[PDB]
Nucleic acid binder design. Structure first.
Ligand SMILES: [Mg+2]
Ligand SMILES: [Mg+2]
Ligand SMILES: [Mg+2]
Ligand SMILES: [Mg+2]
Ligand SMILES: [Mg+2]
Ligand SMILES: [Mg+2]
Ligand SMILES: [Mg+2]
Ligand SMILES: [Mg+2]
Ligand SMILES: [Mg+2]
Ligand SMILES: [Mg+2]
Ligand SMILES: [Mg+2]
Ligand SMILES: [Mg+2]
Ligand SMILES: [Mg+2]
Ligand SMILES: [Mg+2]
Ligand SMILES: [Mg+2]
Ligand SMILES: [Mg+2]
Ligand SMILES: [Mg+2]
Ligand SMILES: [Mg+2]
Ligand SMILES: [Mg+2]
Lengths: 70, 153, 117, 66
RNA sequence: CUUGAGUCUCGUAGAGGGGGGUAGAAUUCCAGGUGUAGCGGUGAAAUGCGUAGAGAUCUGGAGGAAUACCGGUGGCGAAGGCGGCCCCCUGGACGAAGACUGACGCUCAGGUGCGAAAGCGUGGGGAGCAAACAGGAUUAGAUACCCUGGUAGUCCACGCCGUAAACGAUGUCGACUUGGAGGUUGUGCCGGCGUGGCUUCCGGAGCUAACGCGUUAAGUCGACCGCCUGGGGAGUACGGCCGCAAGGUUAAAACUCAAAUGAAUUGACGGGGGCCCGCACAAGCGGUGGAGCAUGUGGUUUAAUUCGAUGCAACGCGA
């Protein structure tokens, strides 16, 4: 994320463009993910758990628009 | 409390000057429901302080209160087993409550003979930043400033 | 002494500390400051306020170069990233650039083991 | 969405066609996920091979910070 | 004889395998420039590094290992497994139209081969990580968890080992038996309509102790193999075989018990989660704990110091 300060662009607005360029490139998440070694078994396990619960969430939701609360 | 509905309580103004603030001061000085004693102490101290300052009663009061009122204090928030002194801005009602409490405590742990003269001398020293009450204000302010990094939870 | 007026601000923002270094555009350190040397230890060193104060001090240190317009290289995941730049813009510099320079391996070396706490 | 490589009769993706490939990398230079562009899986693989080839010949950068 | 099995033609996707080459990012080290008082680390610290110039920053160089993004309940492979890019050698699978052979098939004791990680032998290599180890902490202790280091090893070649929760805890082959939504890869007809391979999720009958499985069956059947027969003793001993070794494999008995076990249910509990409440914290005021005395109690004493209460919920209690 290399933000150029543009003309008449005040500081706040360029700072916010930089924060979003970073949060979009995922610099911080990549850094946190590279702090400690993770065994391949743990990697495969967390990938599968995220897939299973995303799928279960979509399914529970699309049945939630078939139940009434009151 | 958890619920929250503390309707505030009616306090009469003081008879001599008609000030709710001075009545709060009498209440904070009062011991064992003996309000007549406390009122006689407060009026004697205020008359003495006004003669020794020339100003007026209910203005020398607010001048001594001004140099004791804290602006920011620290609340404890435990994070890692240990605690973080967190600076928090003091509400004006609490500003005056704490100023009065500190002034009374200071005037109590003084050396003059009667409580009226001790309170007068404490009020006089607070009007030029020399008593233990303004020392407590300064200590609280320096704690909050030494913890200013933690002005977040 | 010398006049440069176009500097680069390097912020090394770790979890534990913040290091602010101002150089010229050629990489020569004119001055520096750290959160841990600006009056902060342990639980305070790793806060955005300590980094802000470190950046204040590093701006105050390079005063006799007449630096006027700064580039900003941010490196690392620590708390002192945003606050340092918000204090460089304040201190008096005309921030012209903000880049992230966090090193990312494209695979790289095996990291240390996970902490069990 | 709309995988553009199907709609245009594409057999190969041609790493030498830098104008096309620049649409599928970010500013950083990273390959955009097919979930963002809606490219079909077969062409996403073709595109990845093409981008890596173009990077090797210094037609595309690996990164923003070379 | 041609439908099982197989051959050929044309094409398709693929981290399938073996060999070689190469690129970029990053770590570490080396040299040099700038610069100065800290860095690093943690829950907090310390050990450690640093004025003999560290950390930071910049330029050049060396070397090893791994390949961000793509990347996907995506792909390939018999399983183990396989991921930058390029070339060489090479295996399998699938589809479309046909042509060919003519039951050539399925399973498989013994045999034979492949077989993660660790480990072993010889020779290389060694960035990062890191058993052992050392120091610093923590602790009642702390041969740990945390920190600073750090050697085998992790890498390569060749040879060995032959084991893993080597798992779908589900042997292989074949047939049949309602559906729905996706993923991936072919293919016919015109985004729409078909037809194949593999694959993920749900679910019908049926099945199941139940949980669940459900055309990729744990349903309905057939062929062949492997294996089980209460818990412990014990996958241990002895013997054989195999191994350089570590050990692997085959595999008992005495003795001892009345259980051991699976699934599910109601509770209770959690240093699990969520939402609420109470002078529970917070915000406050006044106390108790110290003194003297009153009073009860424990204890001791006594001829007797009558009996009872004796965590909260006994102790100015029955009185
Ligand atoms: Mg660490
Ligand atoms: Mg056999
Ligand atoms: Mg090994
Ligand atoms: Mg070896
Ligand atoms: Mg060796
Ligand atoms: Mg260690
Ligand atoms: Mg076994
Ligand atoms: Mg496995
Ligand atoms: Mg598995
Ligand atoms: Mg088994
Ligand atoms: Mg089902
Ligand atoms: Mg044995
Ligand atoms: Mg033996
Ligand atoms: Mg309280
Ligand atoms: Mg007492
Ligand atoms: Mg008794
Ligand atoms: Mg009794
Ligand atoms: Mg009893
Ligand atoms: Mg009771």
């Amino acid at each position: 994320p290399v933000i150029k300060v543009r003309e008449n662009e005040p500081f706040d607005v360029a700072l916010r463009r930089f924060k979003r360029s970073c949060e979009k490139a995922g610099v911080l998440a990549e850094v946190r993910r590279r702090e400690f070694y993770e065994k391949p078994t743990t990697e495969r396990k967390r990938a599968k758990a995220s897939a299973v619960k995303r799928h279960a969430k979509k399914l529970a939701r699309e049945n939630a628009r078939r139940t009434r609360l009151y | 409390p958890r619920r929250r509905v503390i309707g505030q309580r009616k306090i009469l103004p003081d008879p001599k000057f008609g000030s709710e603030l001075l009545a709060k001061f009498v209440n904070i000085l009062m011991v064992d429901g003996k309000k007549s004693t406390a009122e006689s102490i407060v009026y004697s101290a205020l008359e003495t302080l006004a003669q020794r300052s020339g100003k007026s009663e209910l203005e020398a009061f607010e001048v001594a209160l001004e140099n004791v009122r804290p602006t920011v204090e620290v609340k404890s928030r435990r994070v890692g087993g240990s605690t973080y002194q967190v600076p928090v801005e003091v509400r004006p009602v609490r500003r005056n409550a704490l100023a009065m409490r500190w002034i009374v405590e200071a005037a109590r742990k003084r050396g003059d003979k009667s409580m009226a003269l001790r309170l007068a001398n404490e009020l006089s020293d607070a009007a030029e930043n020399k008593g233990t009450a303004v020392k407590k204000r300064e200590d609280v302010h320096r704690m909050a400033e030494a913890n200013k990094a933690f002005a977040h939870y | 002494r010398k006049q440069v007026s176009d500097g680069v601000a390097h912020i090394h923002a770790s979890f534990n500390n913040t290091i602010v270094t101002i150089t010229d555009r050629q990489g020569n350190a004119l001055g520096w400051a750290t959160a841990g040397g600006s009056g902060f230890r342990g639980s305070r060193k790793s806060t955005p306020f300590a980094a802000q104060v470190a950046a204040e001090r590093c701006a105050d240190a390079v005063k006799e170069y007449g630096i006027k317009n700064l580039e900003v290289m941010v490196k690392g995941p620590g708390p002192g990233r945003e606050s340092t730049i918000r204090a460089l813009n304040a201190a008096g510099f005309r921030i012209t650039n903000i880049t992230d320079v966090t090193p990312i391996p494209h695979x790289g070396c095996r990291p240390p083991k996970k902490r069990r706490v | 969405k709309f995988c553009r490589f199907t709609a245009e009769g594409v057999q190969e993706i041609d790493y030498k066609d830098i104008a096309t490939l620049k649409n599928y990398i970010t500013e950083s230079g990273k390959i955009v996920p097919s979930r963002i562009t809606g490219t079909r899986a077969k062409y996403q693989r073709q595109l990845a091979r093409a981008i890596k080839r173009a990077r090797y010949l210094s037609l595309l950068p690996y990164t923003d910070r070379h």
